């Protein structure tokens, strides 16, 4: 059985315009482990993105954290794009600073 990933995009610290921060895309509850996560800024890929090592939960479903440095502004739009065998097309989740 294959399980589709849950996706949360958020900042490490409360976002303040002009203050350096970290943009996170946390994917969890998916199976199998092969997955692609991209961070997006104003409609294009953010090049340098790192991720945590592969681990899994009690139900054996994997989880990963993708993160990069960023500085939020009032007009810059951020998002995350996730691709998995359970998805017919890559799914995009936008970043809401209040979520």
């Amino acid at each position: 059985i294959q399980r589709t990933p849950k996706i949360q995009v958020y900042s490490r610290h409360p976002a303040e315009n002009g203050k350096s921060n970290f943009l996170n895309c946390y994917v969890s509850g998916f199976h199998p482990s092969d997955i692609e996560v991209d961070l997006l800024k104003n409609g294009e890929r953010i090049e340098k993105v790192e991720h945590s090592d592969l681990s899994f939960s009690k139900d054996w479903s994997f989880y990963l954290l993708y993160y990069t440095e960023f500085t939020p502004t009032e007009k810059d739009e951020y998002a995350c794009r996730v691709n998995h065998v359970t998805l017919s097309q890559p799914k995009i989740v936008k970043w809401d600073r209040d979520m």
Partner: nanobody, 116 residues
Framework: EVKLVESGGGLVQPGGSLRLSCAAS????????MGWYRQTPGKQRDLVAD???????KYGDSVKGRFTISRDNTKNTVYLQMNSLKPEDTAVYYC??????????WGQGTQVTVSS
């Protein structure tokens, strides 16, 4: 909002070349990244190549060195030059685009078959 019109798919021999194109109609100039994904039945769609309005490109590992993407921002058209085609390149090639607000758009896809 944005409509993507693709062309150029079809049958080609192993070791041959093929040139795909994709133009954006409508609310164009609101599209940043454009590119191609490919998909076989039952599986997900994998990245082939894309390019931003600034020219930043990314290629899938299996197509790096054989495919080349180019772009004309004045008419919002991207071109995919596929060289040294292999039977594993057989798939449906979907054009896509991202607005500057990270809204994604897709075309209907074009079939590419590499067979003897």
């Amino acid at each position: 909002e944005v409509k993507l019109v693709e062309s150029g798919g079809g049958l080609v021999q192993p070791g041959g070349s093929l040139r795909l194109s994709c133009a954006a109609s409508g609310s164009i100039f609101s599209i940043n990244t454009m590119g191609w994904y490919r998909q076989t039945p039952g599986k997900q769609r994998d990245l082939v190549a894309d390019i931003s309005s600034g020219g930043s490109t990314k290629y899938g590992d299996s197509v790096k060195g054989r495919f080349t993407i180019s772009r004309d921002n004045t008419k919002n058209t991207v071109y995919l030059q596929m060289n040294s085609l292999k039977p594993e390149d057989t798939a449906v090639y979907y054009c896509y685009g991202l607005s500057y607000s990270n809204d994604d758009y897709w075309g209907q896809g074009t079939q590419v078959t590499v067979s003897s």
